[PDB]
């Protein structure tokens, strides 16, 4: 039964773990907002091969995932969990955390995302041949951007995205449930201080993040079946492990 002091300490700990592993500075992402891909640059990306565009994106996603792994490692409660459960949570949660974090790189005013040094719209990704997935991801980013998360809110929310006791295959489910609840208390406490509990009802349903990850896996199946050799030869091995069937 975590005391108020312990909950306050948990807030600080989660926010520190996030700050240390957030990958890019928010200020740098925001500074780059005026730097938008030109019509010709966008066309250049659209004319790339499906395999090359998938390869680029898999690399960038894997890099983002490596920071999420580091985030998990610095979350004290996470390392308290058994080895199996750490793996189960990260395997299911890594992509979900990245999707949430990416809203920092999304500009709702022109519906663009920071990708390879500049801001581009969803049409930038057309060569992937998964327009429905890209649209869904942009919709998700837009929905989160409307919430106007602070960095501390992103820290606390992403901690909860990772510590999700509903994942199948947990060996110590009740232990994960306790940590999840404590992180809920931390999140709620922080929100209470800033009069921000209103956002709780506006957060995406958990099924949404699960849906996006399922869609991603399915589109990778379509790609991998079409181009099996490129996945084997060129894609990051961690990407394969997490997403290939």
């Amino acid at each position: 039964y975590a005391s108020l002091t312990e909950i306050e300490h948990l807030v600080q700990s989660v926010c520190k773990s996030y700050r240390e592993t957030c990958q890019l500075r928010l200020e740098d992402l925001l500074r780059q907002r005026s730097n938008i891909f030109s019509r010709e640059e966008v066309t250049g990306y659209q004319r790339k091969s499906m395999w090359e565009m998938w390869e680029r994106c898999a690399h960038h996603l894997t890099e983002a995932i490596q920071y999420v792994v580091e985030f998990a490692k610095r979350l004290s409660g996470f390392m308290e969990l058994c080895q199996n459960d750490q793996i189960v949570l990260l395997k299911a949660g890594a992509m979900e955390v990245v999707l949430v974090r990416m809203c920092r790189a999304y500009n709702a005013d022109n519906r663009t995302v920071f990708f390879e040094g500049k801001y581009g719209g969803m049409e930038l990704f057309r060569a992937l041949g998964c327009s429905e997935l890209i649209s869904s991801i942009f919709d998700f980013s837009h929905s989160l951007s409307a919430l106007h998360f602070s960095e501390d809110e992103i820290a606390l929310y992403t901690a909860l995205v990772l510590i999700n006791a509903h994942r199948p295959g947990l060996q110590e489910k009740r232990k994960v449930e306790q940590l999840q609840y404590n992180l809920e208390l931390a999140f709620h406490h922080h929100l209470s201080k800033t009069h921000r509990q209103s956002i709780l009802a506006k957060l995406p349903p958990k099924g949404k993040l699960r849906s996006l990850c399922s869609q991603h896996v399915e589109r990778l199946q379509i790609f991998q079946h079409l181009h099996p050799i490129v996945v084997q030869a060129a894609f990051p091995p961690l990407y394969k492990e997490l997403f290939s069937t």
Binding site: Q66, V69, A72, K73, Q83, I87, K91, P237, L238, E241
Partner: peptide
């Protein structure tokens, strides 16, 4: 697995 390796266990 690679997650195992990255987590150091």
């Amino acid at each position: 697995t690679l997650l195992q390796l990255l987590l150091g266990h």
